[PDB]
Amino acid sequence: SYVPRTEPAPPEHAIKMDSFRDVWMLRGKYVAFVLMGESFLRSPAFTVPESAQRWANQIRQEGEVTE
Structure with missing residues (x-):
C-alpha cells in the first residue's frame, strides 16, 4: 500500500x-515506524x-491510547 517507508536519504x-x-x-x-492499524506514521x-x-511500542500495543 501507500507504505510511508519514507525516503532512504544518502x-x-x-x-x-x-x-x-x-x-x-x-x-x-531517530525516527519510529509503527501505526495502530495497518499504516506507518513516522x-x-x-x-x-x-x-x-x-x-x-506503546502506540503499537495500546494503539495510541497507552493502556
Whole structure:
C-alpha cells in the first residue's frame, strides 16, 4: 500500500542502528515506524533512540491510547 517507508536519504537512508525494533536513524535523528492499524506514521524524530522506541511500542500495543 501507500507504505510511508519514507525516503532512504544518502546521509542516513534507513539505518537500523543496531536492531532497535522500530527505531531507524533518519536525517541524523531517530525516527519510529509503527501505526495502530495497518499504516506507518513516522515520529517527529527524537535525539534519543529509546525515546522514540518506547513511544513506538506503546502506540503499537495500546494503539495510541497507552493502556
